Each structure stands twice: as C-alpha cells, then as structure tokens.
A paper describes a structure:
Recently, RNF112 has emerged as an intriguing addition to the dynamin-like large GTPase superfamily, which has been widely implicated in mediating biological membrane remodeling events, including membrane tubulation, fission, and fusion. To obtain an architectural overview of RNF112, we carried out structural studies on modified Xenopus laevis RNF112 constructs in different nucleotide-loading states. For these constructs (collectively denoted as RNF112T), the N-terminal RING domain, the predicted transmembrane helix, and the C-terminal amphipathic helix were removed. RNF112T is composed of a GTPase domain (GD) and a middle domain (MD) comprising a 3-helix bundle.
Nucleotide-free RNF112T contains several disordered regions in the nucleotide-binding site in the GD, involving all G1-G4 motifs, which take up as much as ~15% of the total GD in terms of the number of amino acid residues. Thus, the disordered G1 motif of RNF112 in the nucleotide-free state makes it unique in the dynamin superfamily, representing an extremely flexible catalytic center before binding nucleotides. However, nucleotide-free RNF112T and RNF112T-GDP form 2 adopt a unique conformation that has never been observed with ATLs. The MD of nucleotide-free RNF112T stays perpendicular to α8G and swings ~30° from the position of GDP•AlF4−-bound RNF112T MD when the GDs are superimposed. Compared to the GDP•AlF4−-bound form, the Hinge 2 loop in nucleotide-free RNF112T involutes toward the GD from the outstretching conformation, leading to an ~90° rotation around the long axis of the MD. Importantly, the GD also exhibited local conformational changes at the backside of the nucleotide-binding pocket, involving redirection of helix α4G and relocation of the loop between α7G and α8G, which creates a big groove to dock the MD. Accompanied by the wedging of the MD into this groove are extensive interdomain contacts. Met456, Met458, Phe459, and Ile462 from the MD; Phe452 and Pro455 from the Hinge 2 loop; and Ile280, Ala284, Tyr308, Met311, Met315, Phe441, Val444, and Leu445 from the GD form a massive intramolecular hydrophobic network. Therefore, the interdomain contacts are unique to nucleotide-free RNF112 and stabilize its specific conformation. Given the similarities with other dynamin superfamily members, a special structural feature of RNF112 is seen at its nucleotide-free state, which is characterized by a 30° rigid-body swing of the MD relative to the GD and a new intramolecular interface between the two domains.
Numbering used by the authors: 148 to 193, 198 to 219, 230 to 233, 240 to 335, 344 to 381, 397 to 544
C-alpha cells in the first residue's frame, strides 16, 4: 500500500485508550529498521503546511539530496513509514507523529490529557503550536513533558520548540514569558528550559511568502539537528523503534490504570507516581509479614503488625507527590483497604494455624 498516516491511539466511549496493536507492529517492528536508532518527532497543539514541509525535507535528506505524499481527527496519528537518515555509517529512523486533541475545551479533558501524555512519553522532540502567549494549560503540558525526561536516562534532556502562530520580537516574547514564570514560581522546569535555550521559541508571521520562508527556515533547522539528539534508554542503548513499540504498549496500560481524578497534566503525572508508591507500600507490607516468624507471641505479633501498618500510612503521606489533597485522600483510603486485606489474610491464617 502507498504510505499514509495511521491512527495509532484514540479514546473509546469509556475514556479508555485504545491501541492499534497490529498497525503499530507493522510500523515499529519492521525487520529493516527496528534496531536502527529511532527519532520520534511529535507535533501538538493548534499543521498541514508544517507537516508536509517536514516530510519533504526528510525525504530529501533520505535520498541524500539537499533540502529545498501529503498529510490530510481526535487522537494520535503517525506517518506509517519512517525516513531513514544517514548517521555514523548507519541510519536513523525518523517517525512523524501528530497529536490531535483539544487544548482548552473542558469536555473530555481527562481523555485529552491521556492521549497527549502518551504522545509526549514517546517523543524525542516536541513541536508545540501555540497562538500568542503561553496559557496555563499549555505550560502544564510543557511541564509534564519536561518531567518525562527525568526518567529516561541520565543526561537526557527534553527538547521542545514553541511555534507561536499569532503573536501580533521573538526576543521580547521569550523574555516576557521568562518574567511571567519567574513571578508565578510555578513551572520550574519550563522556566529552566527557557533560560537554558533547550526550549526555543519561533514566531511565525501570519504575507504568504513571509510565512512560507519562516516555516522553511524553521523546518530546515529541526531536521538538521535530528541526528545529534538521539535519546538513550535507561539501559544506555540508543532508543530504537522496537523500544518505542514496547513503551507505547506499557504506558497505554499505565494510563488506563490511572483511575484517580485529575484536572491537569501535572496532576495526572503525579497521580501515576503516587499509584506506583501505593504498590511499593503494599509490597513492603507483604514482605514484612512474610518475614515474621510463626513462633512470635500472638499479642506481640498483633502490636508489631499494627505499628508497621501505621508507619506505612505515614510513609505514603510523606512521599506522596503533588498538591491535590483530594486525590491523596482517595489513594490513602484505598491503600488502607488494601493493607487491611493483607493484614486480615496473614492474621486470620496465623490465629487458626497457630
């Protein structure tokens, strides 16, 4: 079939994330490039011009030519074939990803956050389209993305480009946003990113030729820096499309299992870490109970299990992340119900057996 965009992920009627497994398999586990170092360019927010220029520039570098089969929706879409760019004596497989979603509509916000989080999780580089100054919801997506690099290798940096489509000077723009963020005292990683030039801002004029040339200039700049921003995984191997297929499956499951309320991307991110912490506590309780002797005096056993139980609820509140207390309360209550099940099983076994 002629190469075309494929919808990788969408949301079903229940807000669950659904993955085209067979489709993603075909793209990512192709025996030609699946062990080539991979690069996932992702576009988010709100284009056809930008996307088509990126493909035209990529297809030129692929055929060893010089930079100077089109792109058409509420999901994650990918161009089903990668562009193989020369690097070392090998190749880099560039996949092109587009996150279609609302940014500010309050309907289906949890699902919008989930789709976007998934794209950001697997991206090597983010192109974020904004209209004028950065709004809070955009900045929160940006902070989530900045946090997704802190768990993907040691010297991993998260690269973000901001395409401001309707500002009215890119110097005054970035300086302005740095000032607003400095007073707000929130979004510390975006602030740091803006000050370290890891986040770049590009201002696009609205007339055709000035927009055309600015897009061309920007697209040339990001395809040229692709080969030097290869991500490495936790192990230290360069990211490959096989790895990306695995990450996509696993983080889709993590997102569908994040069953606690959240109103913002950072809250969804902290909810994911807090659920993990819950499981580290329950496992820690199970281990503690397994190491207790069957010879222990039943009274001394009851007190030790009770105090350990209490200490673990304290530990959940000490290491819980984020500031949504309503969510922490729901999770502690569920942790308490789970710990009491482990306790009831161990204790009821212990009393009747011994």
């Amino acid at each position: 079939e002629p190469d075309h965009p494929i919808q990788l992920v969408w949301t079903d009627v229940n807000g669950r994330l659904s993955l085209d497994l067979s489709g993603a398999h075909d793209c990512f586990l192709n025996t030609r490039y699946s062990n080539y170092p991979v690069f996932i360019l992702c576009i988010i927010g709100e284009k056809s011009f930008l996307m088509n220029y990126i493909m035209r520039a990529l297809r030129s570098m692929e055929m060893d030519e010089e930079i100077s089969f089109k792109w058409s929706t509420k999901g994650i879409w990918m161009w089903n074939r990668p562009f193989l760019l020369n690097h070392k004596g090998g190749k880099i497989a560039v996949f092109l990803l587009d996150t279609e979603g609302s940014l500010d509509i309050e309907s289906d916000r949890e699902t919008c956050i989930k789709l976007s989080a998934l794209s950001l999780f697997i991206s090597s580089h983010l192109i974020f389209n904004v209209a004028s100054n950065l709004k809070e919801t955009e900045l929160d997506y940006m902070e989530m993305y900045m946090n997704m690099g802190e768990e993907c290798g040691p010297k991993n940096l998260q690269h973000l480009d901001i395409l401001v489509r309707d500002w009215y000077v890119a110097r005054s723009y970035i300086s302005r946003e740095i000032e607003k963020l400095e007073k707000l005292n929130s979004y510390p990683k975006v602030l740091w990113s803006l000050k370290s030039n890891q986040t770049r801002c590009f201002l696009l004029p609205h007339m055709d030729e000035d927009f055309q040339e600015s897009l061309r200039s920007y697209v040339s700049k990001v395809v040229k820096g692709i080969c030097t921003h290869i991500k490495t995984n936790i192990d230290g191997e360069l990211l490959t499309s096989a790895h990306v297929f695995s990450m996509l499956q696993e983080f889709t499951e993590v997102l569908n299992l994040q069953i606690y309320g959240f109103s913002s991307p950072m809250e969804m991110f902290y909810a994911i870490k807090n659920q993990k912490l819950m499981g580290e506590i329950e496992n820690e309780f199970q281990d503690f109970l397994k190491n207790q002797s069957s010879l222990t005096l039943p009274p001394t056993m009851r007190v030790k299990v009770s105090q350990k139980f209490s200490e673990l609820l304290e530990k959940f509140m000490q290491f819980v992340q984020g500031s949504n207390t309503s969510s922490h309360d729901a999770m502690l209550k569920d942790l308490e119900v789970r710990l009491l099940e482990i306790q009831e099983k161990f204790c009821n076994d212990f009393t009747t057996r011994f």
